[PDB]
Every structure is written in structure tokens, then in C-alpha cells.
Design an enzyme around this catalytic site. Structure first.
Site, PDB file in Angstrom:
ATOM      1  NE  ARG A  32      67.035 -15.511  -6.376  1.00  0.00           N
ATOM      2  CZ  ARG A  32      65.751 -15.301  -6.449  1.00  0.00           C
ATOM      3  NH1 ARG A  32      65.229 -15.053  -5.432  1.00  0.00           N
ATOM      4  NH2 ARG A  32      65.327 -15.256  -7.630  1.00  0.00           N
ATOM      5  CD  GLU A  72      66.156 -21.337  -5.510  1.00  0.00           C
ATOM      6  OE1 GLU A  72      65.130 -20.915  -5.958  1.00  0.00           O
ATOM      7  OE2 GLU A  72      67.397 -21.175  -5.562  1.00  0.00           O
TER       8      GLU A  72
END
Ligand SMILES: Cc1cc2nc3c(=O)[nH]c(=O)nc-3n(C[C@H](O)[C@H](O)[C@H](O)COP(=O)(O)OP(=O)(O)OC[C@H]3O[C@@H](n4cnc5c(N)ncnc54)[C@H](O)[C@@H]3O)c2cc1C
Ligand code: FES
Ligand code: FES
Lengths: 99, 99, 49, 477, 467, 98, 98
Positions: free
Chosen positions: D41, D422
Site C-alpha cells: 500500500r 483512513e
């Protein structure tokens, strides 16, 4: 009926949103759930009735179990504590009727 | 059901039942019940939050209101810390009837 | 027993979870050789509870 | 995960980036856990918002004798993105050009491919940027900062505006699935459950809102008691910001099933109420219980061919933050933060604003307070709030403005919503780079240009970087 | 002799076998089943365990209210007080204004910190039914929230202040606050205020607790058992027992003793009893700062500045001034100030009384003082500043180890009158050694010198070498 | 500005979002700022978190024992002092794993 | 279950319906929050009614497993299940009978 296990309920109040869980010797979870809900004045979705097994039913726990379940439910709601009732043979034979 | 371990805050219930086949309930005296150690409360129709009408055809009381209609008709429930204390407190609930 | 604590400890002990992960596109060689400026450096970012 | 990066960026005198190479290292600790996915990520976001034609990122996860590091809101994103913004800050400074311009001209445009070859459709970032520039009055506030700095020797201000792109979906494709189970009892009340867990994000609230629209009954008739493996099995973790997306669809499908079954009774009594339909279904022996399920379609990236879409869509946002540092103590105030966040058509703007604010404040913590210390032999010394300083009531930006972007429906998630949990976290880097701007101003007051600021930029790091007669004397007579 | 008697949400609790190791938080949750009050850290930092205490102050002749951290409060210290928890102020059937407002303003996400913040706000309103915005923010210095980013909590609560796209909530729909409808102070405690308090003894599995009623009892017990560990607020001992696995088999709590709680004005300054909570020190010195001329309150203001960013309301209501001094942490914020101002300590035992002006000598080693094992600290005199006497206090707000390596400082200068020439100069530091120190190599060099650039550079050179 | 004592100015917060369409039912809450369903119970302390669940009378408590070393062999474990503590039941190790 | 062996029968039924050993199937309890609006266990009818319920629930599951069955006709039950899971196929179903 002389089911060797007499009628018995444990009612556990969760203290949120009128949520209550009952552990019951009953052939009839649905009506147990309905009669508790109606008596408390909460929707059916707050009341969970659980049955692992019964030490006999023979029809005598098709409806008449609820006279114990409702009373116990009430006590649990009022105290905010779990409450238990298991009938003695004499009480069961007297209260719950027969053929 | 009764093999399920008790919560440390769990209470016991004992049903109090009519000793008359048909009679008006004149008075209820819990004075002796209150002296039994561990007594918490006596539940009657007045403590029902929503509806005292139960049973499959809605013609039953949770707790008797004004009249009793069988020997065994549930009038109320004693709540106490233990089942021995509930039995004892239940004996100290004196009911007066008019047949 | 010998401990491997920091990132730098792990690098020079070849102590990794599996292999290098990589993404690359275009032509690095051409890119740098055609730039007006090049800037290198290093950055450490602490974790978080 | 702590991250170490080594970077080299090549750019033109205009500030246009033409080349970038980044080696990332993460401290994973003593089990693998999620460390590899986290490194993935970071690599998927090493671009942050910026189109870079020539680009190489590597990642290596270190195995160490430390407690195993795991998932934390952002899941390698904020680490990848902070590195990006860090060399970008140095690009702007090296060019002698305004940072806001250098970022703006490097920004992806609609239809661009990322470094991992995913196409950016519904690219709302420019509007987030333009709105945040206008609403924050950034250009006028830049002038007041410069003014403050000329008038003050031992306090300085900084101002920075930072964008973000954050990919939505688990990097492991099969985890993008969810289930629901719904019961309608004969009193018309509905008991709903799904695989999502409530941890303060208002997921249950959202799912009840969803169920209430889907079924066309009030929220008051629907209840969620809990999450259980014996009502919904094989659930994904509540993570990657995706739980309202996955479970919303599940819930929606279970509700459609119930509706389909009630349709005949609706037709026969189109006025008569919910409760009568349900009792009629029951006494007709129709099932009033249904499962629902959803899988995010068409995902799957290959590192081998650099093809396939890892994400279903992207969240976008922008924050402008202003700080005042005390050059003598390393202390600072967060004066003002302006955030514009694309959350599609919010399921719940109260809750989504809640999430932007909470996420931002956790990031504020990551980047400015919140340092863990370990003995040389690897024993954690910071084990409670006496020594680990998370943001307090007094820590937050004194003026704190949040906007949810208008008119940006997201077709491919539940009722055109976007995930929110997030993506906002990294926007606190705006406080970090504002601090960096403040430090530069302090350094020019007394009196090398690319100075080091590691994260977190604590009072220690801010003070030590504010080189003066005191730091010089203490380091050497 | 032996029974512990206190009230919880208006109900009397009789505990016949009080264990001194039992905290109020454990008692509420495991004994009374009141689980509204939470465990977040057990360290006093997070406030999730915040409850309200109400008692009759004998020394002021009034009913007082203050918040504490239940995780650190021994039940054995709570004889004849009344505790109020989150369950005491309302429920979902009838929410208190504080409860309703935090909920409706989106001030509660995971909800775990909510009770604690509710009780901090509630306690503020019992002391000040119309607080400023500033008082409201200050009420939460000891309350942490990981979810909300704080904004919605302050905004919702801003509606209680005198000095206050669709909307996220509607303040107009909030039920108004009627301070008269709060719960009565238990009349039983008003009746018992008239009975004289006597010594109490509690015996636990490992620990004996003596709640002393007089200075005579305390000094007797220390003379015959110098090992007897004084506990006042338990904000340090609580941590030593819970986290450093220290065991003090005999504890004595002297919190009831009047002489340890007194505030006396004298010609040289204000004397506080050693067991005075920091909140009392704060409220006394603040009144003095507002009344007295600036020239007299330089040291007071240094104390107040150190107390500004010093834990929250929960800690300061029970953290004693004497407790801070005798703990003798290297990173005390108060010890450097007391040292720099030369505060006068009175030390007593059975049959001795002495005075020392705090200096480098008072702290001879890590966490040691010059008290003898049978002495206790009676009082500390915080001095008025003289004409031409100036004080500043400073501290690092950034902590890395338990009890070292955070700089905190008291600094004092006295000028020869009419001049800018140094008569006295005291620079004291925490966090630069294993104890509070004075820069005694650097300051003597500066006596006589004028307050100019040559002094600045000499002190800086000196400190860079000496520290 | 070097001698000024810390001073907080008045907070000033703005939250902007989009109204739902005028024709959306009052009963359709999607897109509306409905409070977290548990907020009232959370503020009242009635919301149940794990440790708020009442104990069974036979319930036991567990405490983990952790390594004080970064990398080491375990050479001995001695439980002799553990066993003297009132209420002690057992020490679980790898060998107890079924 | 009141001693009439209803759970035993329903495990028997599901084992046949799914073509897996009874050892892999478990019934723990009856609950209003797993199956709602249930008739009493009465009228000797319970195995007939729930048997059909179970059978339909099992058939739904088989229908979802088919593709994975056809792609691996020998490799075991556990392989079909893991294949379905990692291809995001639902492995939960209701069954109903009137
Ligand atoms: C969350 C938190 C944050 C804090 N922040 C700070 C801070 O920022 N700065 C700072 O300086 N401190 C701080 N402290 C420490 C705090 O000020 C002290 O713990 C407190 O003042 C100790 O007082 P007490 O009454 O609680 O002492 P107790 O813990 O009851 O006792 C402490 C010590 O003093 C002894 N003692 C107490 N009274 C006497 C007396 N009259 N005579 C002799 N010995 C005595 C005791 O025997 C014991 O050894 C913090 C504490 C907490 C819990
Ligand atoms: S539990 Fe954190 S202060 Fe008490
Ligand atoms: S709401 Fe989660 S800690 Fe405050």
C-alpha cells in the site's frame, strides 16, 4: 407430562435498548419471544430466546413454559440483573396443566 | 438450562400462586417476606411495564389482577439472592381472599 | 542470542520477510539524465501506538 | 510500521518531476502479520497525487526482534505519502517556486494512469484543491505569515496545503466481500446483522440508515444487536475503510430479497401498513429471513505485469494548515486547518465529518507528537500516557474547518457514498510541512537549504533544527 | 474502628472488610456492578475513570465537589464522602444535559471516554453553573479521546458557557439545565460532620491502612514505625504499587489532619499544609495574584505557570503539594521553583521541629530528601517576591522516560535596590540529573554584574559547561 | 514575542456538508446527520463493552507472562513462587496447547 | 431437541443432502436470532418441516459449489469450500419449507 426436567428460564438483561436474552426449556421460542416483548413493551427484535435442549416436553412446554419465562423476564428487566427460576415438581404439576 | 453457571449478580425467582379456585384478592401482605434474608422484591400486576394480557388467545394474566381463577393461578413472584431465600420469602406472602 | 533490532540491523543481516516488492514504469536512466536538477536524501518515520 | 526511505528525484527548473527512485524499508518485528500488504500500500501511494513518467519504488520488510507491527489506519499509505511530500517539498525549495504551484502542476489529471497503471476516473482532487485554496484564503494567509515572520525573531509561522489520493479496497482481492442476515419478526420489527464490527466509526448507524431506505420503513423499526460468526460467517476484518461499502451492499441485497417476497401482499393492500404485509406474509408461510452478500467486482493487480486494478475507486481530499512555532522551545500551536474531503454523497455527514476530524487528529499525532522509545536491547520504554503523548483537547487546530465536497456521487459504492475512515489521516502532514516552513523561516533568521526533518516533528526535532547561538554553543563552545 | 462507610450515587455503602489495595474503580465495577466508569490506563493520564466526589469540608464549613481518577483512589481514603458516577446523573430514560449534549453534538464515537468526559463537565457545572469557554476546555486536561478529534465535544458543551449547508445538530432542542435538580448531599453525612473523627484501621491481604485523625497519632505511628508509608492523594504511591510492583505493608493516610491542610498568611509568604491539594494551592495563589501588587507575586506566578500544563483537574484535586516535594522525582515541575525561591519547609517528628530553606542539599540522591525516616513534612511557605526580585518558570512539554530527562526550571534574580546589579541569582533545573539541581558553579560568578549582554553570554557559557 | 506566556485565542469551527434533496422522505435518513445509534447509551454509561459483561460466579482471570529479552533461549521456568499466591490455578505454556 | 432425536435426524438429512460425513456437521442450539417466526416443536411435524428447510439450505449451498466441483471433481470438499471462499462466493444460506 412429568418431563423429568421441569420448566426453567434464565433471563439475562443486557441494559441496552431493552435487549434481553432468555435461556428456556421450551418447545416454543417464537411465542416465548412474543409474550416477553409484549409484556415489556419492546419490539420482538430486542428479545432472543435460546434453547439448547429440554429434558422432555411432550407438549407441556408448547405454551405453558411462558408463564415462567414472562415472570422471570420481568424480574430481570426490573432489577437489571440475570434472574433464574426452575420449578419444583409440585409447582410444575400445579401451575402448568396437563392433558 | 439450570446446569448453566450462574452470573455472580444472578437472582432467584419463586412464583406465588392462588390457594383458591375462584375468589377476589382482598389484600396482599409482604411484611414477613421482607424479613427473609436476601429478599429483593415482590412482583405483581402493578410492576408490568406494558401489558398484563398474555396467552395464546390473550385471555390470560401474567399476574393475577383483582381475582384468582384456579388453585395455582400466579399472583406474583418473589425475587431473592438464593432459591432457599425465595421459597422462604414466598411463604411470608399472606393473601386474603373473598370466595 | 544475537538480536536484530533496527531497520539497519536487519539490512546488514539480510533479515527480511520475503523478497523485494517493486513497481516501476518508464525509463529512469533517461529521466535522470534529462532532468535539470537531481536531489537525493533519506527519511525516517517513527511508528505509532 | 516505522519506515526508512532513501529517495532520488529528478526535476526541471519549472518544478516538473521527470524521474523518481525510492527504496522503502519497514520495521516489521517478530512475525510477518500484515507487514507485506502494508508495504504494498505504501508503494501504491508513493506518487501521492503526482504524475511521474519515470518512477521506481522498491520495498523491503525487515524481520526484527521487536513486537510484530500491524495494521494502523492508513495501512502504509501515510508512510508512502509522507516520503512523496517530503522530496516534493525539496523540489519546490530547490526551484525557488511556490510549493502550492509545484504540487499543482505535478498533479494527475482526469484519465491519467498511476505508476501501477490504474486509470483515475471521477478525479475530484482538483476541485478539492481549488475549493480549499479559496475557502482557506491561502494566498492572503501566506502574506500574513511572511509578515509575522519579518516582525518576530523567536516565533515563526508556516502555512502548507497538501492533497491526497487514497485507494479504496483490500490489496488482497477476495477480502472485498461481505455478508448480512435479516429477520422480520411478526410484529414488523427487523433484526439485522452483518460482518462489520462497531468500533466507534458509526458502521451500525450507517447500515440501519441503508436498511431503512432499502425497505422503506423508519430506522426505529430496525435493530442491530451485535456481530457474530454464527449469524454471518467467513467475514473480512472491519478494515481498509471498506466496511460500509461491503456490508451496505450485503444489507441492501438482503433487504431486496425481503421486499421481493412482500411484493404480492403490497399489491393486494398498497395502503395498509408494513405490519399488515408482514403478518400476511407469515400467515401465508412466506420466509421473513434472508441472507445478503456482496463482492467488489473486477479487482486484481499483478506486480509481475504491472496491470489490473487493485482499487475499486479513490478517495481524494486537501488540507491547508497553519502553525506558529516557538524557535526557543520547539513547542508550537496549530492555528488553523481547512479540509475539503470527497466522501461521495455521504451516508451520514455527521459521522463522516467525525471520521475526517478523528483521522486528521490521529495523523496530527503520528506526525508531531507520538514517539515510541526502545532501549538498545529492544525493550519498549513508552508504555502509557505519561510518556506517550497522544493529542489532547488543547492539541487540535484552534480554527478547524471541514467541508464535504458537494455533487460528487460515487456510482460504484452503496448509494453513491465513498469510504472515509483512513483517507483523511495523511492530510495532517499539512501540519508537518507547515512546521517545516516555519523551521526554514527560523533558519533564515540565523541567518544549508535542504535541512533534515524526520517524523515525528516533535519539540526535540523542531528545536534542534532551529539552529542559533544556543544550539551552536551546546553542540560546541 | 474498622467499618468503611461512604455513599455512591446517593446510596450508603458499608464495607466491613476494606482492603487498602482496593481502588474505587475496582470497587464500583466488580463490587457494585456500576461499569459506566472505565479503565483506560490506570495511571491518571486518560480520565476514562473520572468520577465526582462530594464531601463536607470541616476546614471551610461547606459542601465541596471535585473530580478524581477512580483508578488511583483507594477506597480506604474515602470514609464519609459521597461518590457520583455517570449512572448517578442520569440514564437513557432521563439524560442529564451534559449527557444529552455530548451525544447529540456527535461528541461520542466509540463511547469509551464518554463517561469520563461527561463527569469532568458535570463536575465543572457543580462548581460553576456558568463557566467560560476557557474553564470548559481546562476541565478536560485529564481526559483523552482517540476518535472524535475533540471539536464536537467542545462545540456541544460551548452551549453551557456564558461567553458562547445544514447544521450537524440543533442547540435549541437541548433540554435546559436546572442546577436545583442535582442530587442532595446525603443528610447522613451532614449529621456525621458533627461527630469527631477518630483513627480508623483497615487490614487487607498484604497491607494495613491507618487513617490518622490527629497530628499526635501520625507522629506516634512514625516514631514507633518509621517504615509507615504516608499516602495522601496516592498519585505516586498508586503507580509504585500498580506498575513498579512495590509493596508498603503499613500505610498511614494523614489527609484528615487539620494542621496538614491549613493555609496561613505570614510576613514572608503563604504557608500551605503538606497535604493541601494542588487545586487548593492553585485557588489560593490565584486570589493572591489578583489582589496583591505584581511586585509581591513573582514566585506565586511561577508556581501557577508550572501548574497550568500539569495533569488535569482529577489529579490536582487530590495530588498534594507535600507529595510532589517528597516524591523528589528528577522531573518535578515544583521542586525547581521551590528550590530557586528558597521556600521554607517545616519538618516534624514526635519531639522535633525544624526548618530548612530548600537548596541543593535538600535532595542528596535519586528520589531522596534530607528528612529522617520518622519525620514528616508539615508545611511549605511560598514566599512573596521583594522589590527588585524577579521569577520565571519553564518546562519541556515532551516526555520520553518515566521520571528523568524532561527539563523544567525555576529562575530567580534579586537586584541591589535602585540598580540593575545582581544581589542574588538562582537557576534550578529538573531533568538534567537524577535530582533537582541548582547551577551553583554558574550563578556565583554573576553577583555584582549588571543585567546586560555580557551577563547573558557568561550564564549561557557557564550552563553549557556545568550542565 | 519571546517573553509572552502561552495564550489560546477563541476557537472558531466550521462544518460544511450537502443538504439531501427537498423531496427525500423524512423517514429516509441516508445522507442525513443521524447521531450514532449508541451515543445516548455511551454518554449514560449503559453501553456494554467486553469487560462490562458480568462475571460468572465460577469465572477465572488470566494474566500473560512475557519475555524480558529481545532474543534468547528459555533455559528454565520456575513457578514455585506463583503457586504460593492465593487463588492460583495454573500456568499455561506451549505444552498445554492441545 | 427434547429427546426425540430431531437434531440427529437433521444432521442425517444434511449429511445426505450435502454428500459429506455427519462428522463435519454440527448443531449447537435453537435461537430466534438465527431462524425467526418458528412454529412450536409439536404435532409430530418437526422433522418433516425442518428436514425440508435443511435440505433446501443445503441445495443452495451445493448450487454455489457446482462450478468448483466441475473444475475439480475428485479433490476434496475442503478444496471446493476454500476455492469458493477465495472467489468470494457466499457460504451461508437460509432454507424454508411450507
Ligand atoms: C497523571 C499524572 C500527571 C502528573 N503530572 C505531573 C507534572 O506534570 N509535574 C509534576 O511535577 N508532577 C506530576 N505528577 C506527580 C504529582 O504532582 C504527584 O504525584 C503528587 O503531587 C503526589 O502527591 P500525593 O499526595 O498524590 O502523594 P502520594 O502518592 O500519596 O505520596 C507521594 C510520596 O510523598 C510521601 N508523602 C506525602 N505527604 C507527605 C508528608 N506530608 N510528609 C512526608 N512524606 C509525604 C509519601 O510517603 C510518598 O512517598 C503527576 C501525577 C499523575 C498521576
Ligand atoms: S484509567 Fe486512565 S486515568 Fe484512570
Ligand atoms: S469516542 Fe473513542 S475514545 Fe472518545
Amino acid at each position: 407430562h412429568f418431563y423429568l426436567e421441569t420448566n426453567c428460564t434464565i433471563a439475562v438483561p443486557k441494559g441496552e435498548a431493552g435487549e434481553m436474552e432468555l435461556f428456556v426449556s421450551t418447545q416454543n421460542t417464537m411465542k416465548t419471544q412474543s409474550f416477553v416483548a409484549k409484556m415489556l413493551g419492546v419490539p420482538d427484535n430486542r428479545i432472543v430466546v435460546r434453547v439448547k435442549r429440554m429434558g422432555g416436553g411432550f407438549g407441556g412446554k408448547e405454551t405453558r413454559s411462558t408463564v415462567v419465562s414472562t415472570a422471570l423476564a420481568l424480574a430481570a428487566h426490573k432489577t437489571g440483573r440475570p434472574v433464574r427460576c426452575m420449578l419444583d415438581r409440585d409447582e410444575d404439576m400445579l401451575i402448568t396443566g396437563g392433558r | 438450562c439450570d446446569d448453566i453457571p450462574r452470573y455472580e449478580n444472578e437472582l432467584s425467582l419463586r412464583l406465588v400462586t392462588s390457594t383458591r379456585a375462584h375468589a377476589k384478592i382482598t389484600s396482599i401482605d409482604t411484611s414477613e417476606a421482607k424479613k427473609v434474608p436476601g429478599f429483593v422484591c415482590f412482583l405483581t400486576a402493578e410492576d408490568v411495564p406494558n401489558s398484563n394480557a398474555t396467552g395464546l388467545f390473550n385471555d390470560e394474566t401474567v399476574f393475577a389482577k383483582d381475582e384468582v381463577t384456579c388453585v395455582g393461578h400466579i399472583i406474583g413472584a418473589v425475587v431473592a439472592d438464593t432459591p432457599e431465600h425465595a421459597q422462604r420469602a414466598a411463604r411470608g406472602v399472606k393473601i386474603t381472599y373473598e370466595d | 542470542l544475537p538480536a536484530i533490532i533496527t531497520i539497519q540491523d536487519a539490512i546488514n543481516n539480510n533479515s527480511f520477510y520475503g523478497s523485494e516488492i517493486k513497481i516501476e514504469k518508464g525509463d529512469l536512466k533517461k529521466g535522470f539524465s534529462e532532468a535539470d536538477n537531481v536531489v537525493s536524501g533519506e527519511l525516517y518515520i517513527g511508528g505509532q501506538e | 510500521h516505522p519506515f526508512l526511505a532513501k529517495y532520488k528525484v529528478g526535476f526541471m527548473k519549472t518544478g516538473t518531476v521527470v524521474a523518481l527512485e525510492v527504496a522503502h524499508f519497514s520495521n516489521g518485528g517478530n512475525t510477518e502479520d500484515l507487514s507485506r500488504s502494508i508495504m504494498e500500500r505504501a508503494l501504491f501511494h508513493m506518487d501521492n497525487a503526482y504524475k511521474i513518467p519515470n518512477i521506481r519504488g522498491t520495498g523491503r520488510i525487515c524481520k526484527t526482534n521487536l513486537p510484530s507491527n500491524t495494521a494502523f489506519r492508513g495501512f502504509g499509505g501515510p508512510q508512502g505519502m509522507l516520503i512523496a511530500e517530503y522530496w516534493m517539498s525539496e523540489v519546490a525549495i530547490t526551484c525557488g517556486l511556490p510549493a502550492e504551484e509545484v504540487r499543482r502542476k505535478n498533479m494527475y489529471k482526469e484519465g491519467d494512469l498511476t505508476h501501477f497503471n490504474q486509470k483515475l476516473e471521477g478525479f475530484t482532487l482538483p476541485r478539492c484543491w481549488d475549493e480549499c485554496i479559496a475557502s482557506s484564503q491561502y494566498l492572503a494567509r501566506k502574506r500574513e505569515v511572511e509578515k509575522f515572520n519579518r516582525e518576530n525573531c523567536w516565533k515563526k509561522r508556516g502555512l502548507c496545503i497538501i492533497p491526497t489520493k487514497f485507494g479504496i479496497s483490500f490489496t488482497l482481492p477476495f477480502l472485498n466481500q461481505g455478508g448480512a442476515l435479516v429477520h422480520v419478526y411478526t410484529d414488523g420489527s427487523v433484526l439485522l446483522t452483518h460482518g462489520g464490527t462497531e468500533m466507534g466509526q458509526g458502521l451500525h448507524t450507517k447500515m440501519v440508515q441503508v436498511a431503512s431506505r432499502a425497505l422503506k420503513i423508519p430506522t426505529s423499526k430496525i435493530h442491530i444487536s451485535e456481530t457474530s460468526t454464527n449469524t454471518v460467517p467467513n467475514t473480512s476484518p472491519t478494515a481498509a475503510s471498506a466496511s460500509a461499502d461491503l456490508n451496505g451492499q450485503g444489507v441492501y441485497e438482503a433487504c431486496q430479497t425481503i421486499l421481493k417476497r412482500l411484493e404480492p401482499f403490497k399489491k393486494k393492500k398498497p395502503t395498509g401498513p408494513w405490519e399488515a404485509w408482514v403478518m400476511d406474509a407469515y400467515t401465508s408461510a412466506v420466509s421473513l429471513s434472508a441472507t445478503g452478500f456482496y463482492k467488489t467486482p473486477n479487482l486484481g493487480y499483478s506486480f509481475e505485469t504491472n496491470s489490473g486494478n487493485p482499487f475499486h475507486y479513490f478517495s481524494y481530499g486537501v488540507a491547508c494548515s497553519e502553525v506558529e512555532i516557538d524557535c526557543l522551545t520547539g513547542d508550537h500551536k496549530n492555528l488553523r486547518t481547512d479540509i475539503v474531503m470527497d466522501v461521495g454523497s455521504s451516508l451520514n455527514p455527521a459521522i463522516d465529518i467525525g471520521q475526517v476530524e478523528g483521522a486528521f487528529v490521529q495523523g496530527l499525532g503520528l506526525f508531531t507528537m507520538e514517539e515510541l522509545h526502545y532501549s538498545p536491547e529492544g525493550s519498549l520504554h513508552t508504555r502509557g500516557p505519561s510518556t506517550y503523548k497522544i493529542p489532547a483537547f488543547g492539541s487540535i487546530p484552534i480554527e478547524f474547518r471541514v467541508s464535504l465536497l458537494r455533487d460528487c456521487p460515487n456510482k460504484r459504492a452503496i448509494y453513491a457514498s465513498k469510504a472515509v475512515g483512513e483517507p483523511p489521516l495523511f492530510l495532517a502532514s499539512s501540519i508537518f510541512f507547515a512546521i517545516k516552513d516555519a523551521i526554514r523561516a527560523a533558519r533564515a533568521q540565523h541567518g544549508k537549504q535542504l535541512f533534515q526533518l524526520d517524523s515525528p516533528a516533535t519539540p526535540e526535532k523542531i528545536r534542534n533544527a532551529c539552529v542559533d547561538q544556543f544550539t551552536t554553543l551546546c553542540v560546541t563552545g | 474502628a474498622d467499618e468503611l462507610v461512604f455513599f455512591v450515587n446517593g446510596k450508603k455503602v458499608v464495607e466491613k472488610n476494606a482492603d487498602p489495595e482496593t481502588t474505587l474503580l475496582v470497587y464500583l465495577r466488580r463490587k457494585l456492578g456500576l461499569c459506566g466508569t472505565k479503565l483506560g490506563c490506570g495511571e491518571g493520564g486518560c480520565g476514562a475513570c473520572t468520577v465526582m466526589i462530594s464531601k463536607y469540608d470541616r476546614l471551610q464549613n461547606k459542601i465541596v465537589h471535585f473530580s478524581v481518577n477512580a483508578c488511583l483512589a483507594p477506597i480506604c481514603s474515602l470514609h464519609h464522602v459521597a461518590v457520583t458516577t455517570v449512572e448517578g446523573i442520569g440514564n437513557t430514560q432521563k439524560l442529564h444535559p451534559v449527557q444529552e449534549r455530548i451525544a447529540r453534538s456527535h461528541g461520542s464515537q466509540c463511547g469509551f471516554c464518554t463517561p469520563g468526559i461527561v463527569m469532568s463537565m458535570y463536575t465543572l457545572l457543580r462548581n460553576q453553573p456558568e463557566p467560560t469557554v476557557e474553564e470548559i476546555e481546562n476541565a478536560f486536561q485529564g481526559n483523552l479521546c482517540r476518535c472524535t478529534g475533540y471539536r464536537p465535544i467542545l462545540q456541544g458543551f460551548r452551549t453551557f458557557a456564558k461567553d458562547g449547508s445544514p447544521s450537524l445538530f440543533n442547540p435549541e432542542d437541548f433540554k435546559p439545565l436546572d442546577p436545583t435538580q442535582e442530587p442532595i448531599f446525603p443528610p447522613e453525612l451532614l449529621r456525621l460532620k458533627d461527630t469527631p473523627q477518630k483513627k480508623l484501621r483497615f487490614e487487607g491481604e498484604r497491607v494495613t491502612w491507618i487513617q490518622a485523625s490527629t497530628m499526635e497519632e501520625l507522629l506516634d505511628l512514625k516514631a514507633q514505625h518509621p517504615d509507615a508509608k504516608l499516602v495522601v492523594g496516592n498519585t505516586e504511591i498508586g503507580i509504585e504499587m500498580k506498575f513498579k510492583n512495590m509493596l508498603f505493608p503499613l500505610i498511614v493516610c494523614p489527609a484528615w489532619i487539620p494542621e496538614l491542610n491549613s493555609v496561613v498568611h505570614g510576613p514572608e509568604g503563604i504557608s500551605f499544609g503538606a497535604s493541601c491539594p494542588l487545586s487548593l494551592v492553585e485557588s489560593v495563589l490565584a486570589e493572591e495574584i489578583a489582589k496583591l501588587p505584581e511586585q509581591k507575586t513573582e514566585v506565586f506566578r511561577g508556581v501557577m505557570e508550572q501548574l497550568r500544563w500539569f495533569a488535569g483537574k482529577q489529579v490536582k484535586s487530590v495530588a498534594s503539594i507535600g507529595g510532589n516535594i517528597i516524591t523528589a522525582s528528577p522531573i518535578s515541575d515544583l521542586n525547581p521553583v521551590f528550590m530557586a525561591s528558597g521556600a521554607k519547609l517545616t519538618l516534624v517528628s514526635r519531639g522535633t521541629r525544624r526548618t530548612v530553606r530548600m537548596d541543593h542539599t535538600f535532595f542528596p540522591g535519586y528520589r531522596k530528601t534530607l528528612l529522617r525516616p520518622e519525620e514528616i513534612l508539615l508545611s511549605i511557605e511560598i514566599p512573596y517576591s521583594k522589590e527588585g526580585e524577579f521569577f520565571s518558570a519553564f518546562k519541556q512539554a515532551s516526555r520520553r522516560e518515566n521520571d528523568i530527562a524532561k527539563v523544567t526550571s525555576g529562575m530567580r534574580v534579586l537586584f541591589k535596590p535602585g540598580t540593575i546589579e545582581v544581589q542574588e541569582l538562582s537557576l534550578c533545573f529538573g531533568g538534567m540529573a537524577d535530582r533537582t539541581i541548582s547551577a551553583l558553579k554558574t550563578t556565583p560568578k554573576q553577583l555584582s554584574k549588571s543585567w546586560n549582554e555580557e551577563l547573558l553570554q557568561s550564564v549561557c557559557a557557564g550552563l553549557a559547561e556545568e550542565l | 514575542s519571546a517573553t509572552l506566556l502561552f495564550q489560546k485565542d477563541p476557537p472558531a469551527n466550521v462544518q460544511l456538508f450537502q443538504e439531501v434533496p427537498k423531496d427525500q422522505s423524512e423517514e429516509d435518513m441516508v445522507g442525513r446527520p443521524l447521531p450514532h445509534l449508541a451515543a445516548n447509551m455511551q454518554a449514560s454509561g449503559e453501553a456494554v463493552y467486553c469487560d462490562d459483561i458480568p462475571r460468572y460466579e465460577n469465572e477465572l482471570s488470566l494474566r500473560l507472562v512475557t519475555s524480558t529479552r529481545a532474543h534468547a533461549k528459555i533455559t528454565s521456568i520456575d513457578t514455585s513462587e506463583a503457586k504460593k499466591v492465593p487463588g492460583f490455578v495454573c500456568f499455561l505454556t506451549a505444552e498445554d496447547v492441545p
